[PDB]
Design a protein around this nucleic acid. Structure first.
Lengths: 56, 56
DNA sequence: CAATTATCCTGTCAA
DNA sequence: TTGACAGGATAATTGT
């Protein structure tokens, strides 16, 4: 899994506010890192709470 | 589409409004939402979202 | 207006 | 000390 992430996080300053990525924009963030498209929505919706949530 | 989080609060100003009124037209929609920011068709649905559960 | 198809959000435990 | 699936809740789609 390593460094299939900081790519995701380094851009994440872009849609920090709005994890409402386009359905085919999941692809250009998927395939470039790839793996099952279903697994990728999940990783971005198992991290809204890891931080920022306590940061309030 | 997509799901569109409304979704702060926002909300349960409605949940009694449904208890008050299962009907409205255009004219309220300004202060009803323009002071709240969201679009028209975002919520013309939302009663229709809640004419169930149940509502036998 | 009922029926659909697309969503995430949580809520069940795991190398 | 982080990542997978079923569950139960929800907002759009859409056309007899």
């Amino acid at each position: 899994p390593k460094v299939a992430t900081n790519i995701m996080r380094a851009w994440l300053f872009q849609h920090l506010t709005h994890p409402y990525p386009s359905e085919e924009q999941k692809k250009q963030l998927a395939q470039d890192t790839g793996l099952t498209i279903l697994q990728v929505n999940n990783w971005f919706i198992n991290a809204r709470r890891r931080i920022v949530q306590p940061m309030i | 589409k997509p799901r569109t989080i409304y979704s702060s609060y926002q909300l349960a100003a409605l949940q009694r409004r449904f208890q008050k009124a299962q009907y409205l037209a255009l004219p309220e929609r300004a202060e009803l939402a323009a002071q709240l920011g969201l679009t028209q068709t975002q919520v013309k649905i939302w009663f229709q979202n809640r004419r169930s559960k149940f509502k036998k």
